[PDB]
Curated annotation (Swiss-Prot):
Stretches assigned to the C-type lysozyme domain: 1-129
Residues annotated to bind substrate: D101
More details: Lysozyme C is capable of both hydrolysis and transglycosylation; it also shows a slight esterase activity. It acts rapidly on both peptide-substituted and unsubstituted peptidoglycan, and slowly on chitin oligosaccharides.
Descriptive protein name: Lysozyme C
Reactions catalysed according to its record: Hydrolysis of (1->4)-beta-linkages between N-acetylmuramic acid and N-acetyl-D-glucosamine residues in a peptidoglycan and between N-acetyl-D-glucosamine residues in chitodextrins
Native organism taxonomy: Eukaryota, Metazoa, Chordata, Craniata, Vertebrata
SMART domains in the record: LYZ1 (SM00263)
Main function: Lysozymes have primarily a bacteriolytic function; those in tissues and body fluids are associated with the monocyte-macrophage system and enhance the activity of immunoagents. Has bacteriolytic activity against M.luteus.
EC number in record: 3.2.1.17
Keywords noted in UniProt: Allergen, Antimicrobial, Bacteriolytic enzyme, Disulfide bond, Glycosidase, Hydrolase, Secreted, Signal
One matching Pfam family: Lys
Cell location: Secreted
Subunit structure and binding partners: Monomer.
Domain of life: Eukaryota
Length: 129
């Protein structure tokens, strides 16, 4: 599914992402915009055999179980396929762990390249949630 800008903002807010760990809602919306273009089915296969999944392009190396190494890593305790659901619950809950892992939102390259240092409030402008 491809979310609308404010539709996603509303959903993320519903899941308590607004100001989570000091990161305003606009940061999360901006991140999704440039990581997957608001597409929950977005998948990115890296040249290392790993894959980034979903709306927030979470990498399979550490955060989910893709069936190749059960019992290993999988810090979010979920099958990577769960990150491809139209229901963003899994992606959001896993993102909360990622953002608390010590590198803030810098764990998302698209965010650090196109969102960081900008007025992310623009991403929720007109949403009046």
């Amino acid at each position: 599914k491809v979310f609308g800008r404010c539709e996603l903002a509303a959903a993320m807010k519903r899941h308590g992402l607004d100001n989570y760990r000091g990161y305003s809602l606009g940061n999360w919306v901006c991140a999704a915009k440039f990581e997957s273009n608001f597409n929950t089915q977005a998948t990115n296969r890296n040249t290392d055999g790993s894959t980034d999944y979903g709306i927030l392009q979470i990498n399979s190396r550490w955060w989910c179980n893709d069936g190749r190494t059960p019992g290993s890593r999988n810090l979010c305790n979920i099958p990577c396929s769960a990150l491809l659901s139209s229901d963003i619950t899994a992606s959001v809950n896993c993102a909360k762990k990622i953002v608390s892992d010590g590198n803030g939102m810098n764990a998302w390259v698209a965010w650090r390249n196109r969102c960081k240092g900008t007025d992310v409030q623009a991403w929720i402008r007109g949403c009046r949630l």
